[PDB]
């Protein structure tokens, strides 16, 4: 589910566009998910794609990167970006990104580390042409991390691939 175990309504989300520079679209969660007193919040990063050859980069902070602040952080899907979440009617199901987008390139390496969330950053590259509109999701959840009576936040990435080319 989108909001998760957290009781946040959809109007009480914080939504944001990705930082789009030089055909690279970035979701950086590394300060936005720390334990706040108003927590848990939903922090939703929205990646809208209607252009060719966009590299999507998602930066999700690691457990023990800062001490005590990410001690119960989880990311879903564990095999991101190869596996993503899709929202079918009243459900979130894992699906294969190669199946949803034809021509998609996931580099095995990001910055000489593995292209998995356990190295903190995932990354993928969208093809020159897309004929089929697809919406898919990633979760970077810090809302079970508690420090000083403050709860962390639930991060959502929603990628919208519009048809292009």
């Amino acid at each position, epitope marked *: 589910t989108e909001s998760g175990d957290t009781a946040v309504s959809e109007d009480s989300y914080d939504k*944001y*566009a990705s*930082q789009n520079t030089n055909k690279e679209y970035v979701c*950086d969660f590394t*300060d936005q998910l720390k334990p*706040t007193e108003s927590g848990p919040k939903v922090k939703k990063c929205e990646v809208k794609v209607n252009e060719p050859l966009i590299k999507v980069k998602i930066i999700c*902070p690691l457990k023990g990167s*800062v001490e005590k602040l990410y001690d119960n952080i989880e990311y879903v899907p564990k095999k991101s970006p190869y596996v993503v979440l899709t929202k079918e009617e009243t459900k979130l199901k894992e699906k294969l990104l190669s199946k949803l987008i034809y021509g998609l390139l996931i580099s095995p390496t990001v910055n000489e580390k593995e292209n998995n969330f356990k190295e903190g950053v995932i990354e993928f590259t969208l093809p020159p042409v897309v004929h089929k509109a697809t919406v898919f999701y990633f979760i970077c959840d810090n809302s079970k991390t508690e420090d000083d009576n403050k709860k962390g936040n639930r991060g959502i990435v929603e990628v919208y691939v519009e048809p292009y080319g």
Partner: antibody
Amino acid sequence: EVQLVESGGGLVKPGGSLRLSCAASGFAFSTYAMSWVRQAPGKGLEWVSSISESSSYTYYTDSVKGRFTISRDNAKKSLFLHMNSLRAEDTAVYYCARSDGLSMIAAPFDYWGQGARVTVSS
Amino acid sequence: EIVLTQSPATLSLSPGERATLSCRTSQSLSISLVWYQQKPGQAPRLLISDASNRAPGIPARFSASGSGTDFTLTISSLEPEDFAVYYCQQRSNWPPITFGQGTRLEMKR
């Protein structure tokens, strides 16, 4: 080159309404985020409101939620703050400011207008 | 809401001296702060965005550093033009975007 010129400031009774404007020039206005930042007399800076380039994202500080609306027209190269239900705490110089974007790391306010004084008094 | 606490409230220095301005955040931050200058009667202008991301027209004597909860703006030798108010600002746990209250840089005599 880059210029931001506000207008619309002045005196209002409490409970009154006012519309501020910021006219832009010297840059492609429809590719930048725009913001309003206020400065009370004797006090520092307080972020009020931000709007993304094509108005898909608006953001407000909590004390002006419900009362203030930010908007923009990219054809007229204009930014607006409509302020209703004005209280004496809204007394400030209001700055329009340009930024590259409103991601989760928000871009710095690289260019500022000259300010418009709003005095809410009986 | 991240509260930023600028320290000291007033710094009293002579030109040519290194100025060290502190900004403390109420929560830890791993993304850098943004610093601004304000001369009296004037709009604020952007000074620095990262370690070295000075704005157009902002000279090299302004540098910025810090992480976690402790952040500093350094003016490596003051010019008479630098005696002004300085504001830090966080941009990464937001909304609300929040500023520090200001440090006034005063000339010592």
